[PDB]
Amino acid sequence: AERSELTIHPKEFTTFVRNFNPFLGATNLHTTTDFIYEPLVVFNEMHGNTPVFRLAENFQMSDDLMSVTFDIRKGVKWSDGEAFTADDVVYSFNLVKEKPELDQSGINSWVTGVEKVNDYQVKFRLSEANSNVPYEIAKVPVVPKHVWSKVKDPSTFTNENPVGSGPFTVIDTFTPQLYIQCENPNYWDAANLDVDCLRVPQIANNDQFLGKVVNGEMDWTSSFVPDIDRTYAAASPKHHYWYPPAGTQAFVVNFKNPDAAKNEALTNVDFRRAFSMALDRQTIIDIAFYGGGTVNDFASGLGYAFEAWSDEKTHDKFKAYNSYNAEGAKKLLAKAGFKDVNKDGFVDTPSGKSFELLIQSPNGWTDFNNTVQLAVEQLAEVGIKARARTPDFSVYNQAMLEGTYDVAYTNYFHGADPYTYWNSAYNSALQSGDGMPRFAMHFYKNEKLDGLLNSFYKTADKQEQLEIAHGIQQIIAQDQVTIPVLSGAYMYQYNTTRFTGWWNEENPKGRPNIWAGIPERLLHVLDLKPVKLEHHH
Template identity: 45%
Template sequence: MPTTHEFIFEPLVIFNTLQNNKPEYRLATGYQLDKDLMGISFSLREGVTWSDGKPFSADDVIFSFSIALKYPELDSHGIRQWVKSIEKRSEHEVHFRLKKPNALVAYTLVLFPIVPKHQWQLVDNFAQFTNSDPVGSGPFTDIQALDENGYLQCANPAYWQADRLNIDCLRYPKVTTNDDFISRISKGEFDWTGSFIPDIERHYASYSPDFKYWLPPASNVNLMFNFKVADPDVRDLFSRVEFRRAISMTLQRQLLIDIAAFGQGEPPRYASGMSERFSSWADPIIAEKYRPYVSYNPMLAKDLFDRVNLIDSNGDGWRELPGGKPLALTIITPKGWSDFNTTAQLISEMLRQAGIRVASVQADFLEFNDRLARADYQLAITNYPQGPTPFKYFDMAFNSNYQAPHYPRYAMHYYQNPRVDKLLTQFPIATTNQQRHQIIRELNQIIANQQVTVPLYNTVEFYQYNTRRFEGWFTKENPVASPLIWPQAPERLLHVLSLRPKKQVSEPE
């Protein structure tokens, strides 16, 4: 269930992404990398018990990771690619031996749930185990109700920080559609949520002064060029950075945000597509140098189109390829992704104003992925996964090792740069923050200089909260940690520990 991680199974460490990945120690009290970066040890918190009163120890950690190593289908966070073996050094210390050096392996290891060995060692089939009576280490382990309308998950009296917990239960109701969600949140039913609400001021915030929201920046949505496109004339065109920059400067990004994302987004600051979340990693001089190329400048764009001999040679209003052949491009997006579909249609209209003929094409998601994997497209729109540092974006988006059919779509532009690949191999083994920041700055500069993709807009995280019944919320003015309720934000454990009921609040009529 979505409230299993963190709330039933507490993590070893939470890395606070809004506080420069500051470690917030939970079941662990510290960690230490080996000097050769081929291992890492965790010191475990003493005095912690499971919800059934049994003591938590190193045996539980070793047992949990052994499941992932033995059963690939349960390796939810890619543990097997890094961990070679696990050693118990004492009742409260474990050591992981790695298959290859990685200075940042802790970020991955702490995402894996630690389960109680004394309960799970009796399980015959882990893949089918429903854990209907969970034993956990987190603050909410008691499932008091579970039916077709939702479930009720209540406090663990044995929780090691029970004195900090002021919330008795989490009620997780079933929501059938987005319209259902909007109808119910507008009536004040939900306290803590995170979902897309079009025109959020009108359809939510205006209903009550207690209805609040915060939309922190997330990852970018980019336009991709297929550097391996079948047509050699189009392939030559895509290879010209002047053309890619011209496309970028033809786009009115605020209009994309206002229409396709209902105003919930930000124009990109970085021509590399790096998220605004990681502004502290950027060289401001480099950022400003390339920022004009992700800004609307139709006159300069037309000059660049002319420079690559993309001109209207027959006077019909459309630019032709240098040899005189008509240029007609397509943008592919996943069917049903309304924001992407609308974005593609708007881009088509904007490029037509510059004499570039573009049609938007929608495909089922599986077909969309397959076409990108086979390089069977011209232009495409994609978003990107997030991580605790900018590395995940640059690695997933520009590492040529990921340009194979069994990998996700993010690097399927097929641009390759040996220097980029080398920097991406250096980042995980860099031993200092200064070295890691320098690597990201160089990656940012290379990708921006080449305009490999065209950043369209920075997406946002969806977070709504109701101040009528509870206080202590993480807000834009009080950005303690990520405020999200969903499992991809481990900081939600810190959030729930900060919440407390308001006093003397009358019940709704």
């Protein structure tokens, strides 16, 4: 054809709503960040957080780690031809400070203010010392001031005709079931780009996905695929995948459940430990994930990928509570006083109340749904009554934000050090705010823990940072805050029918996934090249 179209699948939808607002992660399309709004810097997390400079050409932190200046690349244009400058960066950060519902990461608690030094330099002032703040700053979308300052309420703005900095800003085709996002005519890095457009089909769940990917209809995906060698790999020599290791997955319990009986159970550490011992984590990996994961028996959730960081003494002390031990679970329930007093085989609370835990995972995330159903069965074998629900992701998510759920199975962000998981999963500041994600919504709060998290990057002292990690590990482990299950994978499938250049095990340039929130996907698409099709008629 006359243009190359790359078929991608970042996110499940039942119908596409035209929304390219990069601040509205709960309602926008998942090709907005990176592809329409390019970041200042992409940190290559798989390669030691190596900064890859994009719209900024440099940054420099102060010696006291209380401020940082970014240098903006000259000669970059917005897709409408106007210049990308410091003005746009300063506006974007002031916008998020003024409208904190647009803060999806917690940036506002780190950056007290921004200043334009000149047309191509921005200075950020910090609330506390933080050597990790350039990483945090890179998370914030930069939008064109000359457009957005004329918008009446950016927090409700759907941005249907976007002006962007990234490689793909033109909305070529848009229907409820398909849209096509084509090349920015003024793209600053055009000589590096060999893909003409992104083609985005509507896919609601893993079952619908399976049929399409096995039939060779996709190019770049990151979905769960069951029995992948037999179903997908075997269908074509052009069907490939690479699954580098990812983050923790866990059952999260609501410490503020409004039901008296359920609250009584979930806030009890003996109960959380018994729940944890009932689980057969390797069987969950084997059945629900077809072997694609590693047991996580760290009460702190750290997982085995951070051996240099782990306090082995703490891990070993609480490991027994995070290992399969059904008899141990029954004994602990008995010692704690969860006794069955109405002859149905299921333990009741110390106050004598019956209860059944409702465990949720998102609709269509079938690997997680199957994990929950296995756990329900395993819990029954120690006398804990539970049953599964698979609500739509938005309903699942909202139940966690509002604290109406009982237990949720979830994955987490994964980074180059343990802070990505521990901060996002446990910092109580992330339990409030209309832009917050689900990850900290157990509503367990510990002042000492927050203090340690907020000091993680405060000293430039490697040994002290390690001791802070050991402190965090001890607190979370001894309180068994969540029930960690496994460490998962960055699922990624690619097709060599129409494109080459893919990252893979022999070319492991970075995280290969197509999800929003993987900024490396920008770097990945800049490596892809179309293949000339085999002739036919």
